[PDB]
Design an enzyme around this catalytic site. Structure first.
Site: not given
Lengths: 116, 9, 116
Positions: A31-33
């Site tokens: 999960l990678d902003t």
């Protein structure tokens, strides 16, 4: 869910990923902003698929060889959801290091960061 | 190493 | 604040960084749930500045020469807050392209990633 952020524990999710070129598969993805687009391991595509060229900016500088772009869209289902994220296209990791859910996918879940 | 993750063009 | 996730508009915030080597500066930084550790550009540091070498895993593999590691903590102030985030140590980009707020720092802000 609310994922707490912690440097010793990667925020990962279990996702079912559909390349439309082999049967769907559930993989563990980061999960990678800090990702503009999602990244999917080349291993998940028929070794017989066409893939476009693309350039990506990484921590070690621009790379033109490492990621391809998908010819077809990619559907991604997250835990407990019938309805899929739909990605017009996304990146493919030629070395199979990475599975990353990026800002494209997260927009469609309407994920947010929150800083109290 | 620590990991640091991806931008377009 | 709540920060919305969008593939075409990076979640960036302004941030005052104190390198303990020269006066604190304002930078523009990416909030990145996929960074183990914070990254700040070498340009924040004086020229007399001793920095340790280090490995970083990026999009295109492991880089040896691109990042360096600080010996001293680095303090970071987010908008309209007086208490700094203090990082024991953090990564330094020699090419001056990455200013990244990672999970070490978001843990300290008590940041969260929230999926509806």
């Amino acid at each position: 869910p609310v994922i707490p952020l912690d440097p010793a524990r990667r925020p990962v999710i279990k996702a079912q990923v559909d390349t439309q070129t082999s049967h769907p598969k559930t993989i563990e993805a980061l999960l990678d902003t800090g990702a503009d687009m999602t990244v999917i391991p080349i291993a998940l595509f028929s070794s017989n698929t066409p893939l476009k060229n693309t350039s990506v900016l990484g921590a070690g500088g621009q790379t033109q060889d490492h990621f391809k772009l998908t010819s077809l869209p990619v559907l991604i289902r997250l835990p407990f959801r019938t309805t899929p994220i739909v990605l017009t296209s996304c990146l493919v990791d030629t070395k199979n290091n990475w599975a990353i859910i990026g800002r494209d996918a997260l927009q469609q879940c309407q994920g947010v960061l929150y800083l109290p | 190493a620590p990991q640091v993750x991806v931008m377009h063009p």
